[PDB]
Amino acid sequence: AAVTQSPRNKVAVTGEKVTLSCQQTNNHNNMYWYRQDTGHGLRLIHYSYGAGNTEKGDIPDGYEASRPSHEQFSLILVSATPSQSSVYFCASGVGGTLYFGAGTRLSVL
């Protein structure tokens, strides 16, 4: 698809540094990282307006992001904790258009 995330699944142990990666072929400037949890829906973690830029979303604590290039947006869990166990969704967008990746299930032990 036009937005792909790696890995598809990840199991980490408490304290592990985890990197989720998201690659797009849409040529969209903006990219977003969300987590999805029961009751909350999709909450915005960090986003980016272009290469080298990242901006904090609604729940940035615990996570760093990096946008090394136009095509790539990475989410870093600096020291995994069980409350970060979730399904993570990368998206690219222009205007009101959102194009989601298929999601990464993460389980922290």
Tab-separated table of C-alpha atoms in Angstrom:
chain	number	residue	atom	x	y	z
A	1	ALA	CA	0.000	0.000	0.000
A	2	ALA	CA	1.017	3.673	-0.148
A	3	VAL	CA	1.900	3.762	3.607
A	4	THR	CA	3.801	0.830	5.077
A	5	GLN	CA	4.888	0.277	8.691
A	6	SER	CA	7.598	-2.035	10.043
A	7	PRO	CA	7.512	-4.188	12.002
A	8	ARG	CA	3.917	-5.486	11.780
A	9	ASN	CA	4.211	-6.943	15.318
A	10	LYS	CA	6.678	-6.259	18.029
A	11	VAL	CA	7.145	-7.736	21.486
A	12	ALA	CA	9.467	-5.807	23.724
A	13	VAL	CA	10.503	-6.168	27.273
A	14	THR	CA	10.017	-3.357	29.799
A	15	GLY	CA	12.988	-0.955	29.430
A	16	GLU	CA	13.741	-1.831	25.798
A	17	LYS	CA	14.237	0.976	23.256
A	18	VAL	CA	11.806	0.254	20.354
A	19	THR	CA	11.777	1.914	16.921
A	20	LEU	CA	8.723	1.752	14.698
A	21	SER	CA	9.157	2.796	11.144
A	22	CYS	CA	6.775	4.192	8.572
A	23	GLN	CA	7.464	4.675	4.894
A	24	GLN	CA	5.207	6.441	2.393
A	25	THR	CA	5.013	6.649	-1.415
A	26	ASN	CA	2.342	9.378	-1.630
A	27	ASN	CA	4.727	12.272	-1.580
A	28	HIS	CA	2.639	13.954	1.203
A	29	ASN	CA	4.434	16.480	3.364
A	30	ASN	CA	2.685	15.669	6.613
A	31	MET	CA	2.968	12.363	8.503
A	32	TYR	CA	1.404	11.409	11.820
A	33	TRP	CA	1.812	8.713	14.506
A	34	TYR	CA	-1.249	7.684	16.511
A	35	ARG	CA	-1.970	4.879	18.978
A	36	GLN	CA	-5.403	3.237	19.138
A	37	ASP	CA	-6.834	2.150	22.492
A	38	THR	CA	-10.249	0.993	23.655
A	39	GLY	CA	-12.315	3.950	24.863
A	40	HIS	CA	-9.982	6.561	23.388
A	41	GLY	CA	-10.056	6.032	19.649
A	42	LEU	CA	-6.941	7.199	17.852
A	43	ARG	CA	-4.763	9.646	19.797
A	44	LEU	CA	-2.060	11.698	18.166
A	45	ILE	CA	1.460	11.086	19.470
A	46	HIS	CA	3.746	13.205	17.240
A	47	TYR	CA	3.437	14.548	13.692
A	48	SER	CA	5.637	16.233	11.132
A	49	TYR	CA	5.367	18.907	8.440
A	50	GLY	CA	8.421	17.782	6.429
A	51	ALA	CA	11.918	16.264	6.634
A	52	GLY	CA	13.743	17.310	9.790
A	53	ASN	CA	10.584	18.565	11.486
A	54	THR	CA	8.602	16.888	14.212
A	55	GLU	CA	5.872	18.398	16.381
A	56	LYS	CA	4.336	17.055	19.617
A	57	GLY	CA	0.785	15.757	19.374
A	58	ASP	CA	-1.592	15.222	22.271
A	59	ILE	CA	0.209	12.436	24.149
A	60	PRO	CA	3.948	12.801	23.376
A	61	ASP	CA	5.245	11.640	26.781
A	62	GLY	CA	7.423	8.600	26.628
A	63	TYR	CA	7.997	8.831	22.669
A	64	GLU	CA	10.363	10.615	20.411
A	65	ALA	CA	9.923	10.810	16.694
A	66	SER	CA	12.198	11.477	13.776
A	67	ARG	CA	11.600	12.456	10.198
A	68	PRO	CA	14.939	11.671	8.479
A	69	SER	CA	13.594	12.184	4.999
A	70	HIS	CA	10.478	13.022	3.126
A	71	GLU	CA	9.501	9.316	2.795
A	72	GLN	CA	10.214	8.123	6.325
A	73	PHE	CA	8.779	8.885	9.803
A	74	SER	CA	10.019	6.910	12.851
A	75	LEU	CA	8.500	6.551	16.280
A	76	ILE	CA	10.862	5.731	19.148
A	77	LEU	CA	9.710	4.348	22.494
A	78	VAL	CA	12.748	5.430	24.475
A	79	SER	CA	12.191	2.947	27.312
A	80	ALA	CA	9.211	0.689	26.789
A	81	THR	CA	6.607	0.379	29.568
A	82	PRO	CA	3.588	-1.925	29.639
A	83	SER	CA	1.183	1.039	29.287
A	84	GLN	CA	2.678	1.586	25.797
A	85	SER	CA	1.276	-1.783	24.687
A	86	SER	CA	-1.148	-0.712	21.929
A	87	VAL	CA	-1.781	-0.746	18.146
A	88	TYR	CA	0.235	2.079	16.473
A	89	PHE	CA	-0.897	3.661	13.184
A	90	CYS	CA	1.210	5.805	10.914
A	91	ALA	CA	-0.567	8.105	8.419
A	92	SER	CA	0.420	10.624	5.631
A	93	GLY	CA	-1.870	13.487	4.659
A	94	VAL	CA	-2.505	16.690	2.701
A	95	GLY	CA	-5.426	19.009	3.513
A	96	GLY	CA	-8.150	16.936	5.165
A	97	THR	CA	-6.909	13.630	3.496
A	98	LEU	CA	-5.482	10.880	5.702
A	99	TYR	CA	-3.824	7.754	4.320
A	100	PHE	CA	-3.293	5.092	7.222
A	101	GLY	CA	-0.784	2.256	7.321
A	102	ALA	CA	-2.064	-1.145	8.385
A	103	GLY	CA	-0.863	-0.770	12.020
A	104	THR	CA	1.841	-2.279	14.359
A	105	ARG	CA	0.737	-4.351	17.391
A	106	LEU	CA	3.103	-3.793	20.231
A	107	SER	CA	3.139	-5.795	23.453
A	108	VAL	CA	5.460	-4.748	26.245
A	109	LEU	CA	6.434	-7.436	28.727
